[PDB]
């Protein structure tokens, strides 16, 4: 379909607000093209971080907020630590589904 070009990870520090973006398919990630980010931890439940690039995920950790920046859509995770060893993803809830790839390794 269309794949957000992947930055190398969402490299985070203690307080390191990882703006893990994906270089979106048409432009900046949006909310009707749905291009927002997620901070996805392990154990097979990928958890939404900032959905549609304008607001956080619904009930996630203390870091997740969506943004559309540069030519990319993603999430900033601020209040993130090393217990979120996961993928930092930017993908589209684009009105025919929610579809992210793996992104980078956050």
């Amino acid at each position: 379909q269309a794949v957000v070009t992947q930055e190398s990870a969402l490299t985070t520090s203690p307080g390191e607000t990882v703006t893990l973006t994906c270089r979106s398919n048409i432009g900046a990630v949006t909310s009707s093209n749905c291009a927002n980010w997620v901070q996805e931890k392990p154990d097979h439940f990928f958890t939404g971080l900032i959905g549609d690039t304008n607001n956080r995920r619904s009930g996630v950790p203390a870091r997740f907020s969506g943004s559309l920046i540069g030519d990319k859509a993603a999430l900033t995770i601020t209040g993130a630590q090393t217990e979120d060893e996961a993928i930092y993803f930017c993908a589209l809830w684009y009105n025919n589904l929610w579809v992210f790839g793996g992104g980078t390794k956050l």
């Binding site: 809830w93 684009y94 009105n95 025919n96």
Partner: protein
């Protein structure tokens, strides 16, 4: 009445709707429609009224370059020539008033209207109303460039005809178009977009009801909480191939262009052969011409008439009685053949 052009055109601006022949073997929501033909001016004044404003700029007035078609995906206000009334032919370009194009055009059964100015690359919607007139006069031609006749007939009206026609809309706009849907799971994240959009859902006053801004609509999501852009801002035509799901039975009335009156026309004057009149005989060497009604009528006698709409250089057998033959054919005058030595 209807005697003002501008607002009576531009109140309910045109709506491109579902025409059943738009493509190769299927129709679509065609930008230009072809509603109904007004053809009673006997020179072939086919005034096709369809879903575009016939000769109207999209901001309302008589824009000479602008042909105004509109959709909820917006007004294609495009060039004049991209409509072609391909009536078995090219465009038979006469004029266009109101919501109709009035054309004197050549014969052909599979008529088409094509749209190319800002409503599409092109759109072709056809009608079988075969424009073969059979005009006035006996003759077998339509002769404008020679003054063979000025035959009395119908001048289909091309003036500022404001109020003989009434373009209507009752049960105002009813058709399916719900293209303002957005993505959600259970509280649906829709935005502003698509049309005059309400929801028809199992929850919400905007999930089942009017969405007019950004919304997260509850009790009805995508999958079975639908929406719809209904036709508003006008009483659009009747929409045929449309529904009365727009159940607001109301009134929208506007003019229609140019009803017909009396007028002369160019015609094929009578071509006569050489009548072999002899001492007991009458024959006529009629040469071949356009296929013309020769009417060798009984002149005062028992009128068992020789009729013919004939295109052959034949013999018009004039049996001349004491009563004389009444021989008039093809829109020429008659002849009173008194037969005597």
């Amino acid at each position: 009445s209807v005697t003002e052009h501008f607002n009576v055109y531009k109140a309910t601006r045109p709506y491109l709707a579902y025409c059943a022949d738009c493509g190769d073997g299927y129709f679509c929501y065609s930008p230009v429609a072809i509603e109904k033909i007004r053809d009673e001016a006997p020179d072939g004044m086919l005034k096709i009224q369809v879903s575009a404003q016939i000769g109207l700029d999209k901001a309302g007035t008589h824009a000479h370059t602008k042909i105004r078609y509109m959709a909820g995906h917006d007004v294609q206000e495009s060039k004049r020539d991209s409509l072609r009334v391909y009536t078995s032919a090219a465009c038979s370009i006469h004029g266009t008033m109101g919501h109709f194009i009035v054309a004197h055009c050549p014969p052909g059964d599979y008529l088409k209207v094509s749209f190319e100015d800002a409503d599409s690359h092109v759109k072709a919607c056809k009608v079988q109303y075969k424009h073969d007139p059979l005009p006035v006069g006996r003759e077998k031609f339509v002769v404008r460039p020679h003054f063979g006749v000025e035959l009395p007939c119908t001048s289909y009206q091309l003036t500022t005809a404001p109020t003989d026609e009434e373009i209507d809309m009752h049960t105002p706009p009813d058709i399916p178009d719900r293209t303002l849907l957005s993505q959600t799971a259970g509280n649906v994240k829709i935005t502003a977009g698509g049309r005059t959009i309400r929801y028809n859902c199992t929850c919400g006053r905007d999930n089942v009801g009017t969405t007019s801004t950004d919304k997260t609509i509850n009790t009805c999501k995508i999958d079975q909480c639908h929406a719809a852009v209904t036709s508003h801002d006008k009483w659009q035509f009747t929409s045929p191939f449309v529904p009365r799901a727009d159940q607001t039975a109301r009134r929208g009335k506007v003019h229609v262009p140019f009803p017909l009156t009396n007028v002369t026309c160019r015609v094929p004057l009578a071509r006569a052969p050489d009548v072999t009149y002899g001492k007991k005989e009458v024959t006529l060497r009629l040469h071949p011409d356009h296929p013309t009604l020769f009417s060798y009528r009984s002149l005062g006698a028992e009128p068992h008439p020789y009729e013919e709409w004939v295109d052959k250089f034949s013999e018009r057998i004039i049996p001349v009685t004491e009563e004389g033959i009444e021989y008039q054919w093809g829109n020429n005058p008659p002849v009173r053949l008194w037969a005597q030595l």
